């Protein structure tokens, strides 16, 4: 479930976790993200940080570049925001 993926992602350092571990990143989004060079969850975290953790900027970027819908971009944004609040 989405809640379980979010809870598991924010619970611990991400290390070398694949991009698919991020809540909101299913098979389709994960494959598009991997095609763009976002193989690991940390690469997506990098873009979130370069965008200064801005929700509107990150969500617009994920929707336009990877084909994410509003729900998926919110779930992925939320997992990264809460992970950074806990560990960064």
């Amino acid at each position: 479930t989405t809640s379980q993926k979010h809870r598991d992602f924010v619970a611990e350092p991400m290390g070398e976790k694949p991009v698919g571990s991020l809540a909101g990143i299913g098979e389709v989004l994960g494959k598009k993200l991997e095609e763009r060079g976002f193989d690991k969850a940390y690469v997506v975290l990098g873009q979130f940080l370069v965008l200064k953790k801005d929700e509107d900027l990150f969500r617009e970027w994920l929707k336009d570049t990877a084909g994410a819908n509003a729900k998926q971009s919110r779930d992925a944004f939320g997992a990264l925001r809460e992970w950074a609040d806990a560990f960064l």
Partner: protein
């Protein structure tokens, strides 16, 4: 003029030339265009 290339097309050129790279995003576009230019002209 690499501006006509999409991020996907820029990524494809970096891969074709075996130039190590990560994602093409707003903060890396200038770097990868410079690297492509230097590799093509030198």
């Amino acid at each position: 003029n690499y501006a006509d290339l999409s991020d996907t097309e820029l990524t494809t050129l970096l891969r074709r030339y075996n130039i190590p790279h990560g994602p093409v995003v707003g903060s890396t576009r200038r770097l990868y265009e410079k690297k492509i230019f230097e590799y093509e002209t030198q």
